[PDB]
């Protein structure tokens, strides 16, 4: 609502005006009215009331009121209409403005972007929060200096970064689509203000730099030798632009390396590249201004390694617990000292006590020496219940995690209170080590009081120089030893074999002792690092100290392998720093965008607000606006969640402070989505029993309002910020049939050359259902497509855009010309007849091939991921033959629970309808040449993903703290290990795959025993 308890207010409405002479003036006002129009009306009527002798002019004062977010907001932009103020109640107080105007405008623009007032960060006592706010600004100022160093090209490269692949090398199947290694490309030019578009058709080498493409354009009857004059002087004149897009080829990459050009080759489409002046775009850039905000006896210190004492913690009491005293028998506090997901010692419980009296007052003793506590050691705890022939069930009531060391490396001491968190849906584990650290900010909440020991005023974890000294001392006692004994051939082969195991294939105790014995030789095979780290005794400072020295000079590893080390099983800062430094060196902006969803989710596992990963991602977000766009939206989408509100809020502030002009573009996107959220709330609450006809009329009348028309037009698509959303085709916007009332929206593409790409942009807005599962599944599909393309498998998938923008709020890209199977069928030959009728003629084999290739990838992809069962409404088919899937819903076979079946099912079973299409209308569709070729495409594709299994396990391991019910534990991720058959042999994995298909198809999936007979 825009006024508390109200969606919107009638134009005529009263406002209580509190003047500085002490007087209150109820004023007739308009909703449309800007602030000075109201201030005109106010001082017009203020003559009547007492002490009019005591007011300055209207220009001397400013209005102030309370907002929906309980903020005392001063309204400086007085062209803001009243409904867009978001007042709590209709009142305004005029005052004389004090303090910095520039800063308060920016702070409220940042506040609107984030979804919380920036002033709430001022109130946070926690020194880590205030230190983060100050110290993170170094990355901000560093980021703006990087994009102004080689100005104004770096300025343009920030806003319109080159959308490219990682590698310049083409796969052979891409190169062979070109004519003699050349692409036919059309360059468009505007005439003048007349706009009578013209085209210069070119044919050039695929590896041509945009400079060379511009050079060929000016050729397409004058002197020949004079051409060297214009191509040197007027090369910087022009720059290339994609038609129908806000996307530019500003960098000297090969033409084929750009994503649009690579996309145009595969589809068989003419690439259309508008020629445009460089001065036109360069002067258009904002030249933005980042400014530093306004918030920019002796201690008896002691080392951790000096404390001669075992660990103990005192559990005092809990304030309350929500338990029926009749049903539950006892309660207690479960407790553990964790390093990531691994207990450093045995978990210790308090004594059992009555439900009514949660009071313990006992020291729990742990068998771990305080000096052996690793840097990332955490207390994990919960208040658990007991219910219960001498059999009993233990359940968690609430949970909480505490870092044993704070952000300044100080060991915790004395009494502290921990407000606990509610248990996530589906978690039956008594402790929640994967969950975030820190107290619950809601104080109306179970609060466990506890007391750590006190040894001195400040107990610090030792410095790296002190650790190296102990490492050298420890290795001397145990039996240059890197090269003193020689690595045998038998030992060398086993080290290579251990390194090929996947992230979740646990090393044995023999393999642990073997890896640690050969820790000095492991440097030769640096991809073994994650196995070596698992072999360390993390509850032994001797072994940990030696690992630090090995990690210090460890050869850097590939980004995909470094991403393993960012999950919840590797919490040590030296390991995580190493991982981040691999990404800094070797992670391209392309692959950062590919894996950004996971890298943002990794921030939830970080012990502290300030770490090396968040500085890396913030910097990359502030130096690449494509990365910055999705960085913003992934963080913003979870600002409702109080486990990460503070962290993501602080991070989003830092971003919005330094991102420059894009904050204005983001604010329009936020404003647009908020208005769609509000309308769909009203449809679901108020218009529940109303018909879809009436809901449409309600929608159209609300959307036709000028306030909505300004907000919902002329902004950038959150699915792709290159796609500009112009005017609404409001007549063609519709409500979908689904329970949550999704809006099929339709916008004009306002680009000057829109017709050459698309004239309109269709997006499905969705409020009720969680779209993170589909967002993730669609990301994985795109990655699966990329693996297959580079390996020669042309299996074209359709990873259409999907972005979660809030709490179960998301957007979905509409694929044009796509139809469900249920529409086509409405007889087993109907599908083949439709596809033939849509591509009737000589271009029939190209459509059937594209269908068969599309079926293959989705058959394999869906089997691997365990998506929800495919029916005719879930499967779609395009005009050109491309089949694809929608509404993945759940994955990793999440509905294995609420059922007894351990079996791995086949979501996408090929009925006879699909088999007849692949066989080109044949009767015995399971026996033909085309079907046997289809099988081999499924098998090749299956083995290609198995070979890249580590990547997919690593990506899912980064998501475990997301809050998705499908990814709570490593048990859930282990579904893909079973479908990829990673414990089995490659040949056995193929046999497994065949057997699963054959069981699902009821014999119809012809086995390897094909009968020529």
């Amino acid at each position: 609502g825009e006024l508390w308890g109200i969606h919107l207010m009638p134009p005529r409405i009263l406002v209580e005006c509190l003047l500085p002479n002490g007087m209150i003036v109820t004023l007739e006002c308009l909703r449309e009215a800007t602030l000075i129009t109201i201030k005109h009306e106010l001082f017009k009527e203020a003559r009547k009331y007492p002490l009019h002798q005591l007011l300055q002019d209207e220009s001397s004062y400013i209005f102030v009121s309370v907002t929906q977010e309980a903020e005392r907001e001063e309204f400086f932009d007085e062209t803001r209409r009243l409904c867009d103020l978001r007042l709590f109640q209709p009142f305004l107080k005029v005052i004389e403005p004090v303090g910095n105007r520039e800063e308060k405008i920016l702070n409220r623009e940042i506040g609107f972007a984030i979804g919380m007032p920036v002033c709430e960060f001022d109130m946070v006592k926690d020194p880590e929060v205030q230190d983060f706010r100050r110290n993170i600004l170094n990355v901000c100022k560093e980021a703006v200096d990087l994009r102004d160093l080689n100005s104004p090209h770096s300025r343009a490269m920030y806003v319109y970064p080159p959308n490219v692949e990682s590698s310049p090398e083409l796969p052979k199947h891409i190169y062979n689509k070109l004519d003699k290694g050349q692409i036919i490309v059309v360059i468009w030019v505007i005439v003048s203000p007349n706009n009578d578009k013209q085209k210069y058709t070119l044919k050039i080498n695929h590896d041509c730099v945009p400079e060379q493409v511009i050079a060929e354009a000016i050729r397409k009857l004058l002197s020949s030798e004079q051409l060297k004059l214009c191509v040197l002087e007027y090369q910087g004149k022009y720059i290339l632009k994609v038609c129908g897009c806000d996307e530019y080829f500003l960098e000297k990459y090969p033409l084929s390396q750009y994503k649009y050009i690579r996309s145009c080759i595969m589809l068989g489409r003419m690439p259309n590249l508008m020629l445009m002046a460089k001065e036109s775009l360069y002067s258009q850039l904002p030249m933005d201004c980042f400014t530093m905000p306004s918030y920019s006896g002796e201690t008896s210190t002691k080392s951790l390694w000096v404390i001669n004492s075992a660990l103990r913690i005192k559990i005092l009491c809990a304030t309350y617990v929500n338990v029926n005293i009749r049903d539950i028998d006892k309660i207690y506090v479960r407790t553990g000292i964790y390093h990531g997901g691994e207990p450093l010692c045995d978990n210790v419980n308090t004594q059992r006590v009555p439900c009514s009296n949660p009071r313990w007052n006992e020291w729990l003793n742990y068998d771990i020496y305080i000096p052996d506590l690793p840097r990332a050691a955490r207390l994990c705890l919960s208040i658990c219940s007991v219910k219960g022939g001498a059999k009993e069930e233990h359940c968690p009531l609430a949970w909480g995690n505490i870092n044993l060391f704070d952000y300044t490396d100080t060991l915790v001491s004395g009494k502290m209170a921990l407000n606990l968190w509610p248990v996530p849906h589906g978690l039956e584990d008594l402790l929640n080590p994967i969950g975030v650290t820190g107290s619950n900010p809601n104080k109306e909440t179970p609060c466990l009081e506890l007391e750590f020991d006190w040894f001195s005023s400040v107990v610090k974890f030792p410095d790296m120089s002190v650790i190296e000294e102990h490492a050298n001392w420890s290795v001397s006692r145990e039996a240059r030893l890197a090269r003193d004994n020689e690595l045998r051939e038998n030992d060398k082969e086993q080290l290579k074999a251990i390194s090929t195991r996947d992230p979740l294939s646990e090393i044995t105790e023999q393999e642990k002792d073997f890896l640690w014995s050969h820790r000095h030789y492991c440097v030769t095979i640096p991809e073994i690092l994650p196995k070596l780290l698992l072999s360390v005794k993390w509850n032994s400072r001797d072994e940990v100290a030696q690992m630090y020295c090995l990690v210090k000079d460890w050869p850097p590893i590939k980004p995909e392998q470094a991403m393993e080390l960012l999950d919840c099983n590797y919490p040590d800062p030296m390991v995580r720093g190493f991982a981040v430094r691999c990404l800094e060196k070797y992670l391209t902006d392309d692959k950062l965008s590919q894996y950004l969803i996971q890298l943002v989710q990794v921030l939830k596992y970080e012990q502290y607000l300030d770490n090396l990963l968040v500085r890396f991602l913030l910097k990359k977000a502030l130096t690449n606006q494509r990365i910055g766009h999705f960085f913003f939206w992934h963080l913003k989408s979870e600002m409702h969640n109080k486990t990460v509100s503070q962290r993501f809020g602080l991070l989003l502030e830092s971003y919005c402070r330094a991102c420059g002009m894009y904050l204005k573009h983001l604010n329009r996107q936020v404003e647009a989505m908020e208005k769609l959220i509000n309308l769909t709330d009203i449809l679901k609450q108020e218009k529940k029993d109303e018909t879809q006809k009436v809901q449409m009329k309600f929608l159209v009348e609300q959307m036709r309002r000028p306030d909505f028309m300004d907000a919902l037009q002329g902004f950038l698509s959150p699915l792709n910020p290159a796609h500009q959303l112009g005017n609404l085709r409001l007549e063609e916007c519709r409500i979908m049939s689904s329970a949550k009332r999704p809006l099929w929206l339709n916008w004009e593409n306002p680009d000057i050359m829109s017709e050459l790409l698309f004239q309109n942009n269709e997006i499905i807005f969705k409020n009720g259902d969680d779209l993170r599962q589909d967002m993730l599944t669609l990301q994985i599909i795109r990655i699966m497509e990329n693996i297959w393309q580079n390996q020669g498998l042309d299996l074209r998938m359709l990873p259409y855009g999907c972005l979660s923008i809030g709490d179960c709020v998301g957007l979905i890209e509409v694929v044009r010309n796509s139809h469900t199977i249920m529409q086509i069928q409405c007889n087993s030959h109907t599908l083949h007849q439709w596809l033939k009728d849509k591509n009737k003629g000589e271009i029939y084999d190209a459509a059937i091939d594209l269908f068969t290739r599309s079926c293959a990838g989705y058959c394999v992809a869906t089997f691997i991921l365990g998506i929800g069962d495919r029916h005719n409404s879930n499967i779609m088919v395009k005009d050109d033959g491309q089949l694809f899937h929608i509404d993945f819903g759940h994955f990793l076979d999440h509905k294995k629970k609420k059922f007894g079946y351990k079996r791995e099912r086949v979501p996408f079973v090929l009925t006879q309808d699909f088999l007849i299409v692949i066989s080109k209308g044949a009767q015995e569709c399971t026996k033909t040449r085309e079907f046997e070729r289809f099988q081999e495409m499924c098998y090749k594709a299956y083995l290609a993903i198995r070979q890249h299994a580590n990547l997919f396990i690593n990506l899912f391991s980064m998501m475990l703290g997301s809050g998705m019910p499908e990814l709570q534990s490593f048990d859930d991720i282990a579904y893909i290990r079973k479908t990829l058959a990673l414990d089995k042999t490659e040949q056995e994995a193929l046999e497994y795959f065949m057997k699963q298909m054959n069981d699902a198809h009821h014999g119809g999936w012809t086995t390897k025993m094909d009968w020529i007979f």
């Binding site: 929500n322 079973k978 089995k984």
Partner: protein, 277 residues
Amino acid sequence: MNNNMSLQDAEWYWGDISREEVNEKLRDTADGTFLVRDASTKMHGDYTLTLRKGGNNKLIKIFHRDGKYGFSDPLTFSSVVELINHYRNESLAQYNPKLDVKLLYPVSKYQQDQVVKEDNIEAVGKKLHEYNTQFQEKSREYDRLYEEYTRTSQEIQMKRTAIEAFNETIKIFEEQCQTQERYSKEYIEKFKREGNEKEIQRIMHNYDKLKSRISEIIDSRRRLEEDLKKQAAEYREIDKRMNSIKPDLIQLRKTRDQYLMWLTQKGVRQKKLNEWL
């Protein structure tokens, strides 16, 4: 009796179950709990002993060569049953001083048989249906309570913010009283002289309107405080109901799994399991 037993009949032997299936059965169990599965068909070794130590699962590969079994060279045990039973009555300190513990509590594959004493297949299949029906019923009841819990959490937070907004509004209108009291005292004390009560009438009328509006807002904040107290109580009550269902859900699921386990043994058809589930 013991060492002459076959490996197939051994309670602690589980065959080709996955490493994750082992983790399920060992999750949050006491030290000394153990079982044996087949080793991964990609790796060296035949079987894998998994056991609890310091709240962690320790995996120990059992190798084979020329009639002898063991963790490492030399292989000294005539069978797997001899190897296990040896470390049931003796510490693994012998093998490795690091892990001083015995194999105390075998995770039996005949555990379900102790619970489900009924020998008949169809009878056990009918109980599976009864338990699965009860489990799905309580699961849906919990799912409804959790939807309410999350909805109530959202509405409580909106009310909490509205109270803060009311308190800011009450502060601003209270500041206006001080602003009035400040500038009124200088003028009213002058305008009491010159006999102009029309001036005091019009000023005090406005001051009483300010005091009238404050009273209304404070009462509106007071009413919202009671609504919050009402809903905060409901929130705790919804949490109580969920905490009573949780232990019953764990028991029903574990009992269903045992009745499923009993029917996986004796090779019951997959279509018969789906009809009961």
